[PDB]
Design a protein around this ligand. Structure first.
Ligand SMILES: [Mg+2]
Ligand SMILES: [Mg+2]
Ligand SMILES: [Mg+2]
Ligand SMILES: [Mg+2]
Ligand SMILES: [Mg+2]
Ligand SMILES: [Mg+2]
Ligand SMILES: [Mg+2]
Ligand SMILES: [Mg+2]
Lengths: 158, 117, 176, 43, 387, 220, 322, 101
RNA sequence: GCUAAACCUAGCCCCAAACCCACUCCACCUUACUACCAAACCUUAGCCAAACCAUUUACAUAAAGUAUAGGCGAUA
RNA sequence: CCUCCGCAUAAGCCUGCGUCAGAUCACUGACAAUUAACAGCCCAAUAUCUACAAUCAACCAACAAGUCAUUAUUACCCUCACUGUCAACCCAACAGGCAUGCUCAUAAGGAAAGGUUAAAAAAAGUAAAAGGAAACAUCACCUCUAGCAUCACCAGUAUUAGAGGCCAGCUG
């Protein structure tokens, strides 16, 4: 979203211009997720996929800032949780293919405690953390029973 | 033309005045032909005791002493209500002593309330 | 009968009636729940008696015989109701551990502010409740500016109050 | 000067709380009245 | 060309959030919260069913789980059915021959002047004037008010002759009586569900009209079949039905035998009001229906030719116009197109008054005009049948 | 705005439908078409322009009967209530169509031409070339979009393999497939053109306010 | 605007009030194959007729009891036509309106721009009997015109508004069941049935079990005064030209199961304060208590079938003009 | 009771019961002539006709036969020194006709 | 000598310091203050100055109004 | 003596000539009231039905084409709650306006005159000798554009749709 001078001299009308990229519905095959996605993509993205030698590398290599898609970051969390768990659900009844795919991307091993939080927005992480530490409160009956059996076991040792 | 006045039921056209009521609670529901069915169970029954031979008048005599306010905490109610049964059955399954984990089977559930007042 | 809306017919026009104390709370914590139920109806009928006597007092343009015992009966109904709520609360903390009798949640309405939302009872679950889903419990970003403006209005009122307190203190030290 | 020809349906439908909250602009109307400190935010 | 534009149709939900496509991960939705939030994902709710049962929120099973969903479509004939081809279609569905004019057996009841209410012109003039003018507080009564009151008061005039004939003390007129009768016709099953005013019950059945020479003479008659109209137009194609034969009554009922069906057309609007040919068709199907149910109550569900044939007559009206019908049901083997046929005598367009002046014109006084009492002679002939 | 179109009924119905005037306004309540609005009220009779439709569990050609030739407020031609088998439907009337007339809705494309009567509907392969037709489709199964107003007619000019060429009343020729159904004869209510409105009352009663060769086209 | 007197009324003790409005003395009392046909109608409506749609309890007295009473009247006017030829030529109106409009008393306007002015307080009864029988000739009076009777008419000591009685303004009608051009202006008998509100089951559930029979009695006085009174207006009498002969009609009113019988003898149309000065005369309403026609109906037949109730129906249908 | 959330009734549920009644009542003297059976009361706004019947039946053992209620508008026309309207509170009135004569 | 006149103290302003608020009960996005049924982001523009207006036109200290930019002008 | 006004409902207003008391051409405070039958407030699904105007409706007469309807199966048993009800009133003006039903001079509602004098000028009314004036829209027509379907045109289809143009008499 910018402006131009009308015939590339500053002494003409300053009038505003939008430069839109060229979009292409293409289709990809993530080997780690093992799925064909239909993704709208640009020519520069196809070029970066070629330079990374695959969409799994393109997603696991590119930084969150640089990639700049929520969907690409969700693919990244999907692949990283698939690598962080060494999931048998990649290719069931084909363990050699699983171990080959998992050893191809051994470079990006992240622990599972970190791979869940990858690419969450701040509100979505607020939600996930809200569901972690939500609990039904403990009925004070049980707390008072614990304290009183503690006290009667202090009196038992007297 | 007033904004300051409270919007009450006395105030609109006919269609407005019919809908809005005061704070009273619905007892049944409307049916076809605008025929109100009253449901017996939605009407509150005033459970009222028998006051015969009852020794408490509305006032207390001024000759009664002064005491100290001790609000009933759950520690106290646990102590007197539960603590003898645990002391007896410990010197010799928590549901034995008047505890209930759930209360979905219960008529007077404590959270959320179903009783009134 | 209807004669329970009026007191003893000997007391009519006596302009002073000896009534005792109110119930304090600690006197009432010694009574059973059946006994507090019955005392509730004793005080209830007494309260209706005194309210008819007030309204007839204003009607006949006269003063009340003794307006104090209305204050005492409201005092006792308040104490009794508070005791019963104490026992409900303590039992609720033991059996469930909740603190409110009624559920709710901290939400955040269209106006950006954080509100304790008290839940209501419904029959259908919330996702297909057509009227519940018209309420917005989120604030869009055009609200945050007004949140900041409200924040600063509160800060100005607080600053003015605190400063004004210090000025009054200086006047007290000049006067004494 | 009989320009105001009253009805309560037009008044609540034009300027009530629900029409005010129906749009973002109207929510900002309420917020300005709430910030000026007004006793009536709407009809 | 399909009907119903897209703007009035159920709007499609927006397409799912892309997180539901990624195989590994659970999405984070606003279902943890209990309200919409636009920066979380829209969750997918399980199909909720109300556990208990409440009548004002009942949602009935689809049209297969109904315990009588017969695949073979039954065409039903209720009282509202306005037929297309008029009388010919009811003659086909009924398997009957038509005979214009009432028989001499019925009209000969009022041959002598002894079967007459005294001053029948004055009395019928007072019934017309009462219902059509003097009846209610309104200046003109609508057809809704005048129609059943005209029919009702004419039946009271004919009821006043218990003095001359004791036998009329053995007939009542019931209302809100709903009969039903199913029969097969060539290929597909038919049913009449009869819900009309004033079925006049008797203890005694009506004596038959047609001799066996005429019943036998119906064999050489052919039903005038028609085309392109498949002869089940404007009936109600129902799949969810029950084959049943109802006389309208429990068994062991005094006054069990239908005499006259007084069916009327009391709708205020000309669009609503039945056309007189369709009125006649409705009478043929109702008299056929009640007579047929009488045959199934007396003789089982046996497709045969009846030895005691049943006769049920009916009077239908718009208010000022009368249509008489005598129906002679003598076979129950309906499905073939041959053998003996039922036979019916009609009176078409027997108006008893051309017009009624409720307000005087300025010239013509208040009252009816074009009064012709031969039609009440026909009415009173039908009331005195079997007495 | 709260514009919900009345054009909302899903099932075909023989009854008139209460329809709502637009007033020339959009769905956004702004006048897009000047000089509409404020007529006498009308109800809409749903016309079946798919002239050959076999009914449920039927196929092939089928006869139908005209019950009533009815004036229609929603258009210039008058219409016919026409019943066949177990269904009535409103079709659009040809010039000589009486009550009681029988009309064959045909599908079979004959080897020879079909000497059709005045008001029946045939695929364009089954017509003598150089006859007046009306209610012409554009696709097999499209429904009859053209040659539809009062007294109008178009002549089947010539046909090639699986293709007929029509002359519309604007004399622009149209290339349609062979197996598209068109009805023969000219549309009814002739001398709808030859008429004097006389006063502006009738201008206002029809919902009207005051105000402020091409190439032979194909569908193959 | 005028009070709007409902005969079939929920109001407590509406009887005593209607004797005030009406100027009536209520005196208690009165001045074979029929059993077969009656039980045929009872069993016809409860048992023998097959209902398509299920008859709910609220829907009952609209569906069940109304054609029962219709069939009773039509069949008894059938069978009793030889014994009483006046019923052979008598009109039989089903659910046909009777209106009467009269003025009774004076009220000074308590508030507003018309305050302190004499405004006489008008009343209207709009009624629909279930079915009424009207004869062209008039029944003989029961008691003589200007019959003294020592029991006194009630006097209410508050505004009639206090009996939940409300005012409206609408068309003042005086109507007997048909317009004045009809030759059958006089009235024989009138059959009412109490609506679903006034069931004695509810009146026992609410503590007004006393008012049960009162309901019957109120429907007696309001309806018949509105009928006889209206008849008196069709013969030209009104409040200043009072009736020179007593007008008489007759009403069996019911709950569908319990019947009560009433006679009414209108002696005065002079109800206004101008016309109640030299007016010793008053209207008299004779009445019975309610008695059940049958007791129960099981599967097949009736049980506990009273016969005196049919005899009082018949004795109502059997009297004659002269 | 008043100012309490009532528990929701579902079809086949228990009876709604109130143990300590929240709302008081006062019987006033009528300002106009009233029938001898009638008794006038000032119900609080939320109390229905049915609640008043069961209220007098349960607590006071009065055989009530009819109840009729009207809501009375208190004036909003009287002002402060600040030209601000004071509202006299609206109140509900019950007319109770006693049974058994 | 009438009308009047006088009056200090409510409070406020500018700093500093310090990071604020918000469920007695009940009701409150439906016609808010009503007990209870099948979807957010997308360049601010212009005034004005240039004595018109058309590109343009401001939104700790010190280097420094320096380098720079600019109808190489206003100015930045 | 007026009455072209009334009385009700609607919309609107919200206690605004009820009682007690007091201050002020000659409102404040207290208390009390409007009681439901009238009117609002409705409706279990899923399918499937709804060609024949109204007009005293009879024909007759038409065009601008019209304000009104169910059936099939399933589920269904409790019942009279809630709200409106007052007034001399509203929108204006510092003249006017107002929907509907009845009454069509009233059974209902009201008062043109503070007292006087009887100047001018001004307003209104009556009488007066003799004379008797001293452009746009649009039927219809023409032109141009447009071969077509699910938000107007239009649920229309070139006979269509859209845009254009056109003397005697009387009298202050
Ligand atoms: Mg009220
Ligand atoms: Mg400048
Ligand atoms: Mg009513
Ligand atoms: Mg009023
Ligand atoms: Mg007057
Ligand atoms: Mg003067
Ligand atoms: Mg002048
Ligand atoms: Mg002159």
């Amino acid at each position: 979203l910018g402006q131009i001078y009308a015939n590339n001299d500053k002494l003409s009308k300053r009038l505003k211009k939008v430069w839109k990229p060229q979009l292409f519905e293409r289709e990809f095959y993530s080997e780690i997720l093992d799925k064909k996605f239909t993704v709208t993509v640009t020519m520069r993205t196809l070029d970066l996929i070629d330079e990374a030698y695959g969409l799994d590398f393109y997603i696991l290599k590119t930084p969150k800032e640089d990639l700049c898609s929520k969907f690409g970051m969700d693919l990244k969390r999907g692949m990283l949780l698939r690598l962080a768990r060494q999931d048998p659900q990649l290719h069931p009844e084909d363990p050699e293919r699983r171990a080959a795919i998992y050893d191809k991307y051994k470079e990006f091993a992240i622990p599972e405690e970190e791979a869940e939080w990858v690419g969450l927005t701040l509100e979505e992480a607020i939600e996930k953390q809200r569901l972690l530490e939500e609990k039904d409160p403990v009925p004070l009956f049980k707390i008072y029973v614990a304290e009183l059996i503690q006290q009667l076991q202090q009196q038992a040792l007297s | 033309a007033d904004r300051m006045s409270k919007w009450t039921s006395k105030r609109g056209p006919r269609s407005f005045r019919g809908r809005k009521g005061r704070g009273a609670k619905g007892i049944g529901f409307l049916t076809s032909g605008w025929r109100f069915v009253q449901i017996k169970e939605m009407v509150p029954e005033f459970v009222v005791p028998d006051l015969t031979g009852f020794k408490l008048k509305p006032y207390v005599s001024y000759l009664a002493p002064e005491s100290e306010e001790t609000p009933l905490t759950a520690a106290q109610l646990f102590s007197e209500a539960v603590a003898p049964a645990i002391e007896k059955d410990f010197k010799d399954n928590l549901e034995k002593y008047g505890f209930e984990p759930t209360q979905e089977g219960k008529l007077f559930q404590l959270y959320p309330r179903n009783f009134l007042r | 009968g209807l004669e329970e809306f009026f007191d003893d017919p000997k007391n009519w026009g006596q302009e002073k009636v000896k009534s005792g104390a109110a119930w304090t709370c600690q006197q009432l914590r010694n009574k059973s729940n059946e006994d507090l139920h019955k005392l509730w109806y004793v005080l209830l009928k007494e309260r209706n008696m005194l309210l008819t006597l007030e309204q007839e007092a204003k009607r006949q343009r006269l003063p009340m015989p003794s307006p104090e015992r209305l204050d005492k009966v409201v005092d006792s109904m308040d104490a009794l109701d508070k005791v019963v709520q104490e026992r409900e609360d303590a039992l609720r903390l033991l059996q469930t551990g909740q603190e409110r009798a009624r559920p709710g949640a901290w939400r955040r309405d269209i106006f950006g502010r954080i509100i304790w939302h008290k839940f209501k009872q419904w029959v259908i679950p919330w996702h297909l409740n057509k009227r519940y889903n018209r309420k917005r419990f989120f604030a869009l970003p055009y609200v945050d500016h007004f949140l900041r403006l409200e924040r600063e209005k509160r800060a100005r009122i607080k600053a003015r109050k605190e400063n004004l307190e210090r000025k009054k203190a200086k006047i007290l030290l000049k006067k004494f | 000067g009989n320009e105001y020809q009253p009805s309560n349906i037009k008044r609540k439908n034009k300027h009530g709380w629900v029409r005010r909250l129906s749009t973002p602009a109207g929510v900002q109307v309420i917020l300005r009245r709430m910030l000026k400190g007004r006793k009536s935010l709407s009809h | 060309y399909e009907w119903g534009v897209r703007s009035t149709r159920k709007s499609e939900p927006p397409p799912l959030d892309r997180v539901y496509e990624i195989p590994g991960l659970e999405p984070i939705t606003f279902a943890g919260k209990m309200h919409f939030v636009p920066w979380l994902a829209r969750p997918i709710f399980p199909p909720w069913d109300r556990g208990y049962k409440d009548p004002r929120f009942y949602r009935s099973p689809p049209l297969h789980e109904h315990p009588l969903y017969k695949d073979q479509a039954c065409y039903i004939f209720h009282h509202r059915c306005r037929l297309l081809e008029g009388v010919k279609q009811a003659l086909w569905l009924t398997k009957t021959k038509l005979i214009e004019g009432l028989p001499e057996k019925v009209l000969s009841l009022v041959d002598d002047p002894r079967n007459h209410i005294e001053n029948q012109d004055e009395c019928v003039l007072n019934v017309i004037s009462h219902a059509r003018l003097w009846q209610t507080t309104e200046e003109i009564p609508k057809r809704e008010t005048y129609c059943p009151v005209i029919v009702d008061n004419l039946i009271q005039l004919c009821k006043s002759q218990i003095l001359k004939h004791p036998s009329l003390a053995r007939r009542i007129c019931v209302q809100n009586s709903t009969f039903s009768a199913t029969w097969n016709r060539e290929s597909l099953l038919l049913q009449v569900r009869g819900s009309g005013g004033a079925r006049l019950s008797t203890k005694d059945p009506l004596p038959t009209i047609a001799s066996r020479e005429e019943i036998e003479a119906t064999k050489n008659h052919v039903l005038e079949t028609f085309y392109p109209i498949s002869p089940i137009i404007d009936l109600h194609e129902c799949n969810i039905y029950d084959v049943k034969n109802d006389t309208g009554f429990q068994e062991g009922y005094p006054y069990p035998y239908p005499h006259t069906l007084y069916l009327l057309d009391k709708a205020n609007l000309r669009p609503h009001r039945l056309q007189p040919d369709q009125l006649r068709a409705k009478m043929i199907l109702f008299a056929f229906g009640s007579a047929l149910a009488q045959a199934r109550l007396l003789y089982g569900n046996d497709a045969k030719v009846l030895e005691q044939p049943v006769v049920v007559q009916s009077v239908g009206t718009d208010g000022r116009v009368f249509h008489f019908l005598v129906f002679q049901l003598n076979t129950t083997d309906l499905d073939c197109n041959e053998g003996v046929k039922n036979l019916a005598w009609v009176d078409s367009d027997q108006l008893l008054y051309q017009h009624f002046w409720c307000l005087p014109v300025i010239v013509e006084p208040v009252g009816p005009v074009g009064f012709k009492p031969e039609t009440f002679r026909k009415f009173l002939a039908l009331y005195l049948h079997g007495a | 705005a709260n514009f919900v179109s009345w054009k909302s009924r899903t099932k075909y119905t023989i009854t008139p439908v209460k329809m709502r005037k637009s007033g020339g306004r959009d769905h956004t309540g702004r006048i897009r078409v000047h000089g509409i609005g404020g007529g006498h009220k009308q109800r809409y009779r749903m016309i079946d322009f798919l002239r050959f439709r076999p009914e449920e569990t039927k196929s092939g050609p089928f006869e139908e009967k005209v019950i009533q030739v009815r004036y229609d407020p929603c258009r210039s031609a008058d219409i016919a209530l026409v019943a066949g088998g177990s269904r009535k439907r409103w079709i659009i009337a040809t010039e000589n169509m009486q009550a009681g007339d029988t009309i064959l809705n045909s599908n079979h494309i004959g080897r020879m031409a079909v000497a059709a009567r005045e008001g029946d509907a045939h695929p364009l392969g089954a017509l003598p070339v150089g006859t007046l037709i009306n209610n012409v489709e554009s696709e097999p199964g499209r429904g009859a979009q053209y040659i539809r107003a009062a007294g109008t007619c178009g002549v089947l000019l010539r046909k090639v393999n699986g293709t007929a060429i029509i002359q519309l009343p604007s004399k622009r020729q149209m290339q349609v497939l062979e197996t598209c159904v068109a009805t023969v004869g000219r549309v009814s209510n002739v001398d709808h053109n030859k008429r004097v409105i006389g006063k502006a009352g009738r201008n206002r009663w029809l919902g009207k306010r005051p105000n402020s060769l091409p190439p032979m086209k194909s569908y193959v | 605007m005028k009070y709007m007197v409902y005969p079939q009324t929920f109001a407590l003790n509406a009887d005593r009030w209607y004797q005030y409005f009406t100027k009536t003395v209520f005196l208690s009392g009165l001045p074979a194959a029929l059993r077969a046909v009656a039980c045929d109608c009872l069993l016809q409506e409860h048992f023998y007729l097959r209902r398509r749609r299920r008859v709910h309890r609220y829907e009952e007295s609209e569906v069940i009891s109304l054609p029962f009473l219709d069939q009773l009247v039509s069949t008894l006017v059938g069978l009793l036509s030889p014994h009483n030829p006046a019923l052979a030529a008598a009109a039989l109106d089903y659910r046909c309106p009777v209106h009467f409009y009269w003025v009774r008393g004076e009220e000074i306007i308590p508030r507003g721009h018309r305050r302190g002015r004499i405004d006489d307080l008008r009343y209207q009864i709009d009624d629909k009997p279930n079915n009424q029988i009207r004869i062209s000739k008039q029944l003989a009076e029961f008691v003589p015109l200007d019959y003294s009777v020592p029991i006194e008419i009630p006097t209410i000591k508050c505004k009639p508004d206090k009996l939940p009685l409300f005012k409206r303004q609408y068309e003042n009608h005086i109507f007997v069941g048909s317009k004045t051009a009809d030759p059958c202006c006089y009235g024989h008998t009138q059959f009412h049935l109490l609506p679903d509100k006034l069931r004695r089951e509810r009146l026992l559930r609410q503590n007004c079990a006393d008012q049960i029979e009162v309901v019957f009695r109120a429907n007696a006085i309001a309806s018949l005064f509105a009928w006889t009174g209206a008849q008196a207006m069709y013969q030209g009498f009104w409040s200043e030209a009072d009736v020179t002969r007593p007008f008489v009609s007759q009403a069996v009113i019911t709950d569908g199961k319990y019947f009560s019988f009433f006679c009414y003898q209108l002696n005065t149309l002079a109800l206004t304060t101008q016309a109640d000065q030299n007016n010793p005369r008053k209207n008299i309403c004779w009445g019975t208590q309610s008695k059940p026609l049958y007791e129960t109906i099981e599967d097949n037949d009736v049980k506990g079938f009273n016969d005196d109730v049919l005899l009082q129906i018949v004795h109502f249908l059997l009297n004659r003009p002269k | 009771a008043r100012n309490v959330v009532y528990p929701l009734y579902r079809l086949g549920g228990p009876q709604l019961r109130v143990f300590r009644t929240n709302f008081f009542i006062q019987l006033v003297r009528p300002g106009v002539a009233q029938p001898e059976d009638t008794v006038q009361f000032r119900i609080p706004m939320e109390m229905t006709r049915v609640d008043l019947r069961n209220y007098l039946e349960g607590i006071y053992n009065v055989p009530v036969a009819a109840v009729r209620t009207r809501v009375q508008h208190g004036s909003n026309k009287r002002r402060d020194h600040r030209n601000v309207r004071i509202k006299k509170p609206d109140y509900k009135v019950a007319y109770v006709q006693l049974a058994h004569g």
